[PDB]
Amino acid sequence: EIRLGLPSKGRMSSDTLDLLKDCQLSVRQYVAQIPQISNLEVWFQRPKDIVRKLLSGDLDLGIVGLDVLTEFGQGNEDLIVVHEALEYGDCRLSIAIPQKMPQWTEDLRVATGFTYLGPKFMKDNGHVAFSTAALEAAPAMGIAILDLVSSGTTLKENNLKEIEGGTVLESQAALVASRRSMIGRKGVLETTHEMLERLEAHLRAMGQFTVVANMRGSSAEEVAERVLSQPSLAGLQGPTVSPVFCKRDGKVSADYYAIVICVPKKALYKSIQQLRAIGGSGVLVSPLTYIFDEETPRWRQLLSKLG
Amino acid sequence: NTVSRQEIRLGLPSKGRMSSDTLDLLKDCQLSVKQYVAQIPQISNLEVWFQRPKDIVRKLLSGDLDLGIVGLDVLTEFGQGNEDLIVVHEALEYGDCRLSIAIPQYGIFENVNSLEELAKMPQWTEDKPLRVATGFTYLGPKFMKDNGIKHVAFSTADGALEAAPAMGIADAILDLVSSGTTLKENNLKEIEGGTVLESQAALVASRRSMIGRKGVLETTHEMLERLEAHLRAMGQFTVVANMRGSSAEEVAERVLSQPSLAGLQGPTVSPVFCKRDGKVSADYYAIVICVPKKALYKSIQQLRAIGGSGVLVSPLTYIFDEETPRWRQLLSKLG
Amino acid sequence: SRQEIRLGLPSKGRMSSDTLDLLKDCQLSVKQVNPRQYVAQIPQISNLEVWFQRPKDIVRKLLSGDLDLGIVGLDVLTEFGQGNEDLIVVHEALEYGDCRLSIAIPQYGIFENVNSLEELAKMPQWTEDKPLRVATGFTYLGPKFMKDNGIKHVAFSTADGALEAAPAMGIADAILDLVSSGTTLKENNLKEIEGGTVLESQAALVASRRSMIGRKGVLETTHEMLERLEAHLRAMGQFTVVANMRGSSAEEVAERVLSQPSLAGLQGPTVSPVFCKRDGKVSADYYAIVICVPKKALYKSIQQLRAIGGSGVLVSPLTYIFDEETPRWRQLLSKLGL
Amino acid sequence: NGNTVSRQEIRLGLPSKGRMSSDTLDLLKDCQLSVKQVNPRQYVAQIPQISNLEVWFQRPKDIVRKLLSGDLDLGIVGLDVLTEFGQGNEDLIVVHEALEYGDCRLSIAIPQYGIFENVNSLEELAKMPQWTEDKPLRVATGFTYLGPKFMKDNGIKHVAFSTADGALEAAPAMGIADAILDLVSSGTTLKENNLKEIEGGTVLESQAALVASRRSMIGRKGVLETTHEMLERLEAHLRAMGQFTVVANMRGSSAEEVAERVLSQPSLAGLQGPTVSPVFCKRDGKVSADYYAIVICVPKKALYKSIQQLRAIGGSGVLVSPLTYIFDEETPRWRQLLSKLG
Amino acid sequence: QEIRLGLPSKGRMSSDTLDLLKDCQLSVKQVNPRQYVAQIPQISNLEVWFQRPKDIVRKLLSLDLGIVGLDVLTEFGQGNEDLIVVHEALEYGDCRLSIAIPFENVNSLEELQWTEDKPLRVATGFTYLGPKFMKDNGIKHVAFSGALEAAPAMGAILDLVSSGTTLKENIEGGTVLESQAALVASRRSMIGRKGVLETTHEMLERLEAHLRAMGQFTVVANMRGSSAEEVAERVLSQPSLAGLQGPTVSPVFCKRDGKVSADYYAIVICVPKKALYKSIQQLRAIGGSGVLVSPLTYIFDEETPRWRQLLSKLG
Amino acid sequence: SRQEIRLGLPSKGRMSSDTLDLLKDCQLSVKQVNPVAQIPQISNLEVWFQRPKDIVRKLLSGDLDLGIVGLDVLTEFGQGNEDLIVVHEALEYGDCRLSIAIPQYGIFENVNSLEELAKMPQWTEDKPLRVATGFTYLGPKFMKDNGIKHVAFSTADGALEAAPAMGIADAILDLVSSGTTLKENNLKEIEGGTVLESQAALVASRRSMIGRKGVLETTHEMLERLEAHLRAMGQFTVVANMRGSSAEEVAERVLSQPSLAGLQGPTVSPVFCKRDGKVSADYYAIVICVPKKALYKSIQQLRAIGGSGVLVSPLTYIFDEETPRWRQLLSKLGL
Numbered sequence A: 001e002i003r004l005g006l007p008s009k010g011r012m013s014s015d016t017l018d019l020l021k022d023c024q025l026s027v028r029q030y031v032a033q034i035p036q037i038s039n040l041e042v043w044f045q046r047p048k049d050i051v052r053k054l055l056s057g058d059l060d061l062g063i064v065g066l067d068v069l070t071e072f073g074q075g076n077e078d079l080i081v082v083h084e085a086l087e088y089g090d091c092r093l094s095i096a097i098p099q100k101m102p103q104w105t106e107d108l109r110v111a112t113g114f115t116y117l118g119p120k121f122m123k124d125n126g127h128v129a130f131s132t133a134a135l136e137a138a139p140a141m142g143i144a145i146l147d148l149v150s151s152g153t154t155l156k157e158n159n160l161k162e163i164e165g166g167t168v169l170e171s172q173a174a175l176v177a178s179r180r181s182m183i184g185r186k187g188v189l190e191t192t193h194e195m196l197e198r199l200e201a202h203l204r205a206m207g208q209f210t211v212v213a214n215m216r217g218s219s220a221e222e223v224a225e226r227v228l229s230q231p232s233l234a235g236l237q238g239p240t241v242s243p244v245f246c247k248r249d250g251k252v253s254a255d256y257y258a259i260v261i262c263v264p265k266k267a268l269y270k271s272i273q274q275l276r277a278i279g280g281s282g283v284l285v286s287p288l289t290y291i292f293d294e295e296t297p298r299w300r301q302l303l304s305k306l307g
Numbered sequence B: 001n002t003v004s005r006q007e008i009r010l011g012l013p014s015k016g017r018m019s020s021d022t023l024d025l026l027k028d029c030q031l032s033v034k035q036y037v038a039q040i041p042q043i044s045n046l047e048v049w050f051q052r053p054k055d056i057v058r059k060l061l062s063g064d065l066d067l068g069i070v071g072l073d074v075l076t077e078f079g080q081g082n083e084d085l086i087v088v089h090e091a092l093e094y095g096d097c098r099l100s101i102a103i104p105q106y107g108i109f110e111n112v113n114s115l116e117e118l119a120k121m122p123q124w125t126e127d128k129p130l131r132v133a134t135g136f137t138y139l140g141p142k143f144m145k146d147n148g149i150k151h152v153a154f155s156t157a158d159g160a161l162e163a164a165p166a167m168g169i170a171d172a173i174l175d176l177v178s179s180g181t182t183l184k185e186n187n188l189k190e191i192e193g194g195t196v197l198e199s200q201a202a203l204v205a206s207r208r209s210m211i212g213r214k215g216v217l218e219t220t221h222e223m224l225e226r227l228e229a230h231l232r233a234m235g236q237f238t239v240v241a242n243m244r245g246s247s248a249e250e251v252a253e254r255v256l257s258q259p260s261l262a263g264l265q266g267p268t269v270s271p272v273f274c275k276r277d278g279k280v281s282a283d284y285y286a287i288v289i290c291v292p293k294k295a296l297y298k299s300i301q302q303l304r305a306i307g308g309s310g311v312l313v314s315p316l317t318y319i320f321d322e323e324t325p326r327w328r329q330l331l332s333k334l335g
Numbered sequence C: 001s002r003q004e005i006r007l008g009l010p011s012k013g014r015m016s017s018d019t020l021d022l023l024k025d026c027q028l029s030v031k032q033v034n035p036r037q038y039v040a041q042i043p044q045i046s047n048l049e050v051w052f053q054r055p056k057d058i059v060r061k062l063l064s065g066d067l068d069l070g071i072v073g074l075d076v077l078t079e080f081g082q083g084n085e086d087l088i089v090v091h092e093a094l095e096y097g098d099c100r101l102s103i104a105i106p107q108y109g110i111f112e113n114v115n116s117l118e119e120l121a122k123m124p125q126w127t128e129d130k131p132l133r134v135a136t137g138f139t140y141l142g143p144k145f146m147k148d149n150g151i152k153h154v155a156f157s158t159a160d161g162a163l164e165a166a167p168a169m170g171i172a173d174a175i176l177d178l179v180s181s182g183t184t185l186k187e188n189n190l191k192e193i194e195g196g197t198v199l200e201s202q203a204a205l206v207a208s209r210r211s212m213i214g215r216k217g218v219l220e221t222t223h224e225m226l227e228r229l230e231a232h233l234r235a236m237g238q239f240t241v242v243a244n245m246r247g248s249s250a251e252e253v254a255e256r257v258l259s260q261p262s263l264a265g266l267q268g269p270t271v272s273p274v275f276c277k278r279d280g281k282v283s284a285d286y287y288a289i290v291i292c293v294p295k296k297a298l299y300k301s302i303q304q305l306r307a308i309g310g311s312g313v314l315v316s317p318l319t320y321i322f323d324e325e326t327p328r329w330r331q332l333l334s335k336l337g338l
Numbered sequence D: 001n002g003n004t005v006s007r008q009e010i011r012l013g014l015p016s017k018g019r020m021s022s023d024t025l026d027l028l029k030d031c032q033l034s035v036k037q038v039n040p041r042q043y044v045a046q047i048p049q050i051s052n053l054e055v056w057f058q059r060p061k062d063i064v065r066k067l068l069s070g071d072l073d074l075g076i077v078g079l080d081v082l083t084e085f086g087q088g089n090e091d092l093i094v095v096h097e098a099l100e101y102g103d104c105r106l107s108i109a110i111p112q113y114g115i116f117e118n119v120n121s122l123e124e125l126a127k128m129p130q131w132t133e134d135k136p137l138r139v140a141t142g143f144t145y146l147g148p149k150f151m152k153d154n155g156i157k158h159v160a161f162s163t164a165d166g167a168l169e170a171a172p173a174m175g176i177a178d179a180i181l182d183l184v185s186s187g188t189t190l191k192e193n194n195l196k197e198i199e200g201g202t203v204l205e206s207q208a209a210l211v212a213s214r215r216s217m218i219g220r221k222g223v224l225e226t227t228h229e230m231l232e233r234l235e236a237h238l239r240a241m242g243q244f245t246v247v248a249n250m251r252g253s254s255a256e257e258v259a260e261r262v263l264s265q266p267s268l269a270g271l272q273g274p275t276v277s278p279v280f281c282k283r284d285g286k287v288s289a290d291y292y293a294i295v296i297c298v299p300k301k302a303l304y305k306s307i308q309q310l311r312a313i314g315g316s317g318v319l320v321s322p323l324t325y326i327f328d329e330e331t332p333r334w335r336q337l338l339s340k341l342g
Numbered sequence E: 001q002e003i004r005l006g007l008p009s010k011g012r013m014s015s016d017t018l019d020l021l022k023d024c025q026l027s028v029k030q031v032n033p034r035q036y037v038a039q040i041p042q043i044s045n046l047e048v049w050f051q052r053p054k055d056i057v058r059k060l061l062s063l064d065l066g067i068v069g070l071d072v073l074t075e076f077g078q079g080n081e082d083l084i085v086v087h088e089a090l091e092y093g094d095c096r097l098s099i100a101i102p103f104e105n106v107n108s109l110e111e112l113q114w115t116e117d118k119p120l121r122v123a124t125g126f127t128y129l130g131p132k133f134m135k136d137n138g139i140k141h142v143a144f145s146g147a148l149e150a151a152p153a154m155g156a157i158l159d160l161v162s163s164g165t166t167l168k169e170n171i172e173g174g175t176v177l178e179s180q181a182a183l184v185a186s187r188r189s190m191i192g193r194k195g196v197l198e199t200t201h202e203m204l205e206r207l208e209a210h211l212r213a214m215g216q217f218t219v220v221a222n223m224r225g226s227s228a229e230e231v232a233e234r235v236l237s238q239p240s241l242a243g244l245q246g247p248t249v250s251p252v253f254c255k256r257d258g259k260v261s262a263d264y265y266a267i268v269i270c271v272p273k274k275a276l277y278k279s280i281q282q283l284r285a286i287g288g289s290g291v292l293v294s295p296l297t298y299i300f301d302e303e304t305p306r307w308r309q310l311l312s313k314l315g
Numbered sequence F: 001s002r003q004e005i006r007l008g009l010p011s012k013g014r015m016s017s018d019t020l021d022l023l024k025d026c027q028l029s030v031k032q033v034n035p036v037a038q039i040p041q042i043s044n045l046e047v048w049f050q051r052p053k054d055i056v057r058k059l060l061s062g063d064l065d066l067g068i069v070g071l072d073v074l075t076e077f078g079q080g081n082e083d084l085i086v087v088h089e090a091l092e093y094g095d096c097r098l099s100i101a102i103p104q105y106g107i108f109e110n111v112n113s114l115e116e117l118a119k120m121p122q123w124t125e126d127k128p129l130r131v132a133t134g135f136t137y138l139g140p141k142f143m144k145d146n147g148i149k150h151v152a153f154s155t156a157d158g159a160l161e162a163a164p165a166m167g168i169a170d171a172i173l174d175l176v177s178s179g180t181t182l183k184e185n186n187l188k189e190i191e192g193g194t195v196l197e198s199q200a201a202l203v204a205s206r207r208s209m210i211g212r213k214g215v216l217e218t219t220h221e222m223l224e225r226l227e228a229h230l231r232a233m234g235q236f237t238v239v240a241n242m243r244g245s246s247a248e249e250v251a252e253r254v255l256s257q258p259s260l261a262g263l264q265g266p267t268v269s270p271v272f273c274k275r276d277g278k279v280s281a282d283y284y285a286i287v288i289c290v291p292k293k294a295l296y297k298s299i300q301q302l303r304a305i306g307g308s309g310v311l312v313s314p315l316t317y318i319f320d321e322e323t324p325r326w327r328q329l330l331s332k333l334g335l
């Protein structure tokens, strides 16, 4: 049996279920199954509960923000980040001040819910005491900020600004695994492998469009010659070119050719312009679930961390 | 109005089904949105403001917005026919309704089946006018000053607008009709010529913003083409079929004999190989065509008649083709 | 009277959301004009109008003729239809709403060494005085099941609150309830018995025979409905997989793909040329292949595709896969014959 | 039957959902009979102020079913529900027939306009040539039982019934039915849909009622005494609901002079007369009974007028406060219950 | 034939208003909760309409009575002589509309650069009343145009202040006005519609008596004593045990050695709620026990000048 | 650092609503600004809403001065800390008991007391008695006192009561109120299995009451208001009209009756009514307190002695001679 922890509430939870639904890995009850991965069982927990059960051995995998992983995991050696950047849950844990200064003789208050990571940053380049408090309004009320910043709007609303070097950590959602489970529970390691591969291929896919265009041409080679002259019509390896038939004088002839290329989403609009310039029409654009390519070093780095 | 601002602002409905359908349209365009102000990353430097629809029209006129998506009813009532508002796309194919006049089927309106015979009723004079309950304070007076009805007072009715004729608050109603079931439940009928306006959700733009603010026209162009290609796609199916044949050309002749297997320009035909007696040969060919969704079932039958099997059907985000006159007409309105 | 085809759908419950999700996955989205109102449209099918009802009301209205089609669990069809021959199951297994209506008895006590329905019947505790008490919501199917299996002294009741708690509270001796995973039964120290299953149930497409033979348009939209649901189930199902591969000709690449066990596709790989510029000349150095891959096979197929030099492997889902018609249509027409 | 089950508790069924539920819980709170909802998800709570009294929250239809089977002993339910689901069973005894909430009438409504414009009477509706065995009068209603009974009684033969989809009142406008049989309270739903009531169209007048099972009352230990207490408490609560206690300071020489003053006033009579007591205050360091306080019950509808009268005779500092119960002589209801029991 | 009184539909004003009527034993008979008309049956022909406060002012300007914030009355009422506030202080919804600035050493509005160009930008919801304060206070350089408290960070403010904590999260003379909930009536009904004047009279009397009561406690104590006058002297020796006019003193009997005698006396006084606790201490000091404390719906006393002031406004 | 008294109250659950209902009925109304609050009825008193566990902890840390919490939370999380003093141990809501439940079937059939669970031998150092519980601290302390050491405790996932049926645990340690959960899950209490009796309680910190000026007197005020209200909740005031010749005759009648005793005896005053144009005190009104549980029987008794028009009404407070809860608190404080 293989157990994977997922966030139970917050946007991290809805974004995680949205991620799984986009991978075609769909999951009142709190325990579910992902049937497309053999013997994989999902447990919905708060992220701190994912870290706690991963350390104890009740879970084998988890998806958690890097902030929760580093504070509640404490840099414990048992935890290994398999994928460090699932590209959601973007934030940074940092300190905010109003818009070395010697006023402290042990007799500087920072309000934070991160009871642990504040103290650690004081050994690196730091007289600091921590509290727990509307957290964002704490400097104005006199409680004491060290908090998560994403868009930074909360900082501007409370007349608070950010410092150079004030970012203690950059955080995304991450796929993490238990070391005791990967070495000791047979069957876990291969599904963490499959999970990493699927997440990489989905992230690449997310990503691209497949673009298919009708083009008038005499040969497949002339048409490909036209597509490859265009800078952003390169595709992964080049246009797939196939014949397109239509009835002329009661007889059929391949007057058109259909090309298919991958196009990055950010490049789509200008690509369309380019395709119109070389005579393409009826341009079908569609999304992808996965794009599998050559494996990234992430698997080998995981094995290097394991031995 | 005149504010140094790097970003193009697009107003979207904040509450109602227009909000949910608008966010649904953007998600179907793969235009994911990032409080009350968000960003659309895919369109360069495009920033979305969620507002009440009247506030979208008001802020477009005041200059706080550059584009908006709003129903044509909200646009015509609150814009009041101002020439600065240009509909860029007049038919986003959701929010369909019509603002019209409904009158009772009973009482004195039994044989009042046209707006004209509603007019010539000696019941209403300067003292006791024709009471019409509506939330459309501007458009009612306009519709009947355009059609010559002398003595009409308009009111906003307490609670259930449709029940006002039954309660005695008003003699008729001026309201939005979609399926018409609300009218039928209260013994109300429309009339010939009673339709004040036909409405859909529309992409609207400010003339002053497009002319004066850098980048507005290009992102309006991108949004219009994206909306047109997405509507075209929603639209069609991609249909891919395996067919046994000796050559690609024979297979193509077979699919083209069929009326609704034409596709956009014709079938794409490619070889399909399989192992026979340890040797492979292109015993099959796979064809690809676009099929309109309303033709899908019939197309499947036709594909079976010519030997097709394993017919894959899948949807499209966009279909980009030749640009519609909507762009050229917008530039015509701008000079 | 009327010229629209009416399709009944469950209004509340998990059956309702799963049904609307099935229709959206078919690109048959429902045009909820009023979300307070109970009637919507499916524009992709001509004159097809959806009515949101309680499932019992779907069966009642199919029998009365106010609906023509319905999607309902087989348990509800059996309990509220009572085997009326006018209700015909068109598609018997839409693969959601899986459960079984069965008998559960305590694990402990009097029922320790009772594990068959016959051994439940044999117990002597049950006479006209003091019968076997069964708590159930299935007012019709319980008595029929128990009169058919020779269990002679049984009284049935509806229970307050948690049906599964009725035997512990003393309200009842056994229950007749729906079992899916069976965890509710385990949580309440209950067990099924051999022969205790009254019926196996899924969501199903049902039609009125009077509507199909007598009302214009019903039989063809039932045909399209059956064909679309079957094709969608097949699609759910597969992935289309497209890979770039280096090769000199289409035949060499095809032989490489077919040498691999699970890269067979439905009929074999489609192989087309992929052109790329080398030294200012364009040439088909690569070829793109497309195959269907079953989803449970996806990962291994990827490995197989990498072994033969594949790259840039696009994976995407399908709304439909239409193939040869299943006998379900011919079976329907035979049921209509007379 | 649940008439044989051994249980120490006396069981009172209360409506689980609806306006009847909240109004019933309001009635209990106004009687200081607060229900200790042990679990809100659970359906059973306790009323600790009455010995061995346990409340079950049920559908009203389930309250009637359970009273007939003997699984409940008392219930509070509208008389419409009692007539529909009890069907006039002789075992159901109405102990209190008018709890003065849930007021409505089940009646027949037909369109104001159409063929029914001159139809104001019920047998005007009967002497109508439109309905035969071929095409009957369609009536939408949720009352599967009471409709047939009412119209077999009033000389109308050719009638069909439907449990209409959704908005019952909109059934005649949609063409689902030609009339409706429904509950009317203020009648605004009838006016909103251009429908009207009829002479003789009223099927029954209904309020919330305290009902009991006769087999339970005679056979189950403790039931009769707690229905006695409930009826008494309810009667008193209604009387209190009702009155104000009014207390006034008055300048006077003796209690009898003050009493003479209050009793000259028409609405200062009280239940039996003003209670009069001395009110002392320090003048120049000595206390003396310069004032007197009077206590009277005043009906709420008289309060304002009573105040004016109390000022005319020199009253001030008029304290007005409400009452939980007013117990007086028993009404005939209890004896009537015993006559129905034998 | 009908007298109509408007009440707020949503907000704390709504729950506080229905709580006010609920405390007055004028229960509101909401026959349809979805509908907007209810009745007060204890006052003959008194009908309640639930709507937003601007709508209440709108209909009083077009209703016979309304209960609305003084802010809504002054902004939407236009200072019209037809709207007469009969009771100006129902003691709920209390607040002040005032100006807050981030602007450090500026503490008076006069110190509040601002010209034709760059006119003092205040984001504010007071479409009518905003102009009034500065058109009257001599800053001619002001323009008016969400999540208001962050407006100084986002790009001074004129808003409602109650406890002021919302202001603290983000001046002298900045107060535009002080507001409470008020019972207002239209002159058109009072001079012209029969029965409006009389039910406004009853409403004003009930509201004044309830406000007095809200207010006090009735306190009843057992005290051992020989005579009523002795016990009364003991109660009156204590400063805040005076009551309205003095303690009501009555005999309390108990069985001693098989014979009954008035060994105790019960006193009744009104005690203000704010004074209750020390009143209990004082009552214990003079030998009281079993002190029953209970609330009041109304305390009617002599009419306030408000009715005669209203009639002076009516002539 | 801070200057005004802080009172912790439960934030969520029925404990929260029942607590706010009690305080509002005690005239300690909480003025919630928006979701920290204030109680203005006690001069200068400030409320903090927290999770029950947090209140105890914050009392221990110094951040709180008072709290209202169930005694189970107090004993489980306070760990018997001497800084926490219960001021009122029984606010008469949140009633429950923390106790041990075991199955009725199987091994445990003929086991109906704690000592018989002890003299059961299924449990060894290797395979101990598995008890599912949320009380990480309290449970072990209870069983070393009169049970075995062959006990392991666990936190059950999900439904604690279903843990013995699922095989997770052999017994549970849980809160019992009405006992329906245990009966629904075929579980049973044992004699001597009760670990603790719990109600909601008013708790205070010793450091705050002795050391922070103003804390002790506002706990005095809230303790007296809470005790007073509880006493009143409690009683009825009952007032009856009685025909009689003298007040003493009427008093003798009420006192001849067992349960009409009142607190000290009936108050008796004259009731006047018009006879022949003359007024005379033909009646007398008596006032007594009646415990609510006795009300109905007292009514019968009042009728037996000729009473009529019996007014019954409730009380907010009943203050008497000072309760020993204050004197005992001061004894625990060293005055």
Ligand SMILES: N[C@@H](Cc1c[nH]c[nH+]1)C(=O)O
Pocket: A234, A235, A236, A237, A238, A239, A240, A260, A261, A262, C242, C243, C244, C274, C288, C311, C312, C313, C314
């Ligand atoms: N041959 C095209 C499309 C494709 C990608 N993968 C398979 N086909 C490209 O390389 O971009």
Ligand SMILES: N[C@@H](Cc1c[nH]c[nH+]1)C(=O)O
Pocket: A212, A213, A214, A244, A258, A281, A282, A283, A284, B262, B263, B264, B265, B266, B267, B268, B288, B289, B290
């Ligand atoms: N060649 C097919 C499919 C296609 C459209 N666009 C690109 N390919 C058609 O013309 O319909």
Ligand SMILES: N[C@@H](Cc1c[nH]c[nH+]1)C(=O)O
Pocket: B240, B241, B242, B272, B286, B309, B310, B311, B312, C264, C265, C266, C267, C268, C269, C270, C290, C291, C292
């Ligand atoms: N011929 C490929 C792809 C395909 C399916 N259908 C049409 N083409 C296969 O059989 O998998």
Ligand SMILES: N[C@@H](Cc1c[nH]c[nH+]1)C(=O)O
Pocket: D269, D270, D271, D272, D273, D274, D275, D295, D296, D297, F239, F240, F241, F271, F285, F308, F309, F310, F311
């Ligand atoms: N004696 C007063 C007050 C009272 C009624 N009952 C007891 N006391 C009256 O008859 O109104």
Ligand SMILES: N[C@@H](Cc1c[nH]c[nH+]1)C(=O)O
Pocket: D247, D248, D249, D279, D293, D316, D317, D318, D319, E242, E243, E244, E245, E246, E247, E248, E268, E269, E270
């Ligand atoms: N006599 C007491 C109580 C009271 C007021 N009104 C009537 N009684 C007082 O003057 O305060």
Ligand SMILES: N[C@@H](Cc1c[nH]c[nH+]1)C(=O)O
Pocket: E220, E221, E222, E252, E266, E289, E290, E291, E292, F261, F262, F263, F264, F265, F266, F267, F287, F288, F289
């Ligand atoms: N004297 C009555 C009522 C009372 C109590 N306290 C004051 N009065 C009694 O002792 O019960």
